[PDB]
Ligand binder design. Sequence first.
Ligand SMILES: NC(=O)n1cc(NC(=O)N2CCC[C@H]2C(=O)Nc2cccc(OC(F)(F)F)c2)c2ccccc21
Length: 217
Amino acid sequence: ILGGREAEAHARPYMASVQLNGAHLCGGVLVAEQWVLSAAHCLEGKVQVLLGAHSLSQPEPSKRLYDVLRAVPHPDSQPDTIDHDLLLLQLSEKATLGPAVRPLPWQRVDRDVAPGTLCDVAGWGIVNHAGRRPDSLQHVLLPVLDRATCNTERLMCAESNRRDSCKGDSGGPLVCGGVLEGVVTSGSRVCGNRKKPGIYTRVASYAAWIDSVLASA
Ligand SMILES: NC(=O)n1cc(NC(=O)N2CCC[C@H]2C(=O)Nc2cccc(OC(F)(F)F)c2)c2ccccc21
């Protein structure tokens, strides 16, 4: 997250860190007791999910690491596009839920968020153009753009005036009104440049797919 602030500890209990070899790789969102949503290019070693965290490195009683039983990328995802860039991760067991570990409701109704609404994006992605990697969860509020400025019907954008998502925030949540609306996409892009908006996968466009996969337990 560029141009953001340290989040309050455990105040976004849906957050997840998607980890490779013990190292944060992508954001993710707990969307059911046993399922985390993230981005497709995250899956392309050992993939694990860390829930209940604020610090990546410091002891916290709420922190628990999970193995992944099944990874379900979107079947139309491809490694060279940011279309269909969703990934569902089934945890090896149901997560122990509590105030620090809670699923977030996600948008099933296919309507755009009102342009200019401020939504919250969180993550442990880089925090400056030197690639400084934060130990504690970051977040920022960002205004949603109209579709015509963003240019599909399956993507939304947000302003990128120095405040923005960036590398390592991929897969993480864009939240409005307490509901997941977007998932940070996982393609490379210039960050922080007002002419080059942040891009996020519109979760409401994928309602049937998500429901399907979650139906499969
Ligand atoms: N939407 C955005 O603006 N972006 C999304 C990006 N894609 C990723 O981010 N990833 C691809 C999959 C794994 C992942 C990744 O590289 N993860 C990664 C790799 C090394 C270190 C790392 O941790 C930390 F973020 F802290 F650096 C994460 C990205 C890259 C550069 C610039 C903008 C970017």
